[PDB]
Amino acid sequence: VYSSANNCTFEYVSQPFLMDLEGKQGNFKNLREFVFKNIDGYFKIYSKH
Amino acid sequence: KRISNCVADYSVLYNSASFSTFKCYGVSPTKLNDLCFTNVYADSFVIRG
Numbered sequence A: 001v002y003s004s005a006n007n008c009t010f011e012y013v014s015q016p017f018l019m020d021l022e023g024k025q026g027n028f029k030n031l032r033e034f035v036f037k038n039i040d041g042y043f044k045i046y047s048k049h
Numbered sequence B: 001k002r003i004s005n006c007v008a009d010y011s012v013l014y015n016s017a018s019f020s021t022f023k024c025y026g027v028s029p030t031k032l033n034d035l036c037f038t039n040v041y042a043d044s045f046v047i048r049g
């Protein structure tokens, strides 16, 4: 995902999330929507499965 | 070491007495719980008395 890093400030972990790493060719069963916003430098996340 | 994104707790820092020097330049340590800062840094080294 990157070559290297030098210095930074923020790091967050939250609760663990478990997904499936097996990929198939069948029809979809779930829909996920995400909204990313930036007002006054504040990052906003909106999602609901 | 950079310390950020946490609730500061200096209560155990001044209530103890194992330390020998508790001088705070610039700001006064009598009001520290009412002050909110953006970045907190902490260095560490050993030197003779």
Ligand SMILES: *[C@@H]1O[C@H](CO)[C@@H](O)[C@H](O)[C@H]1NC(C)=O
Binding pocket: A006, A007, A008, A009
């Ligand atoms: C990280 O290092 C760069 C030097 O390339 C500097 O410009 C930047 O201010 C540093 N970031 C922080 C948060 O100190």
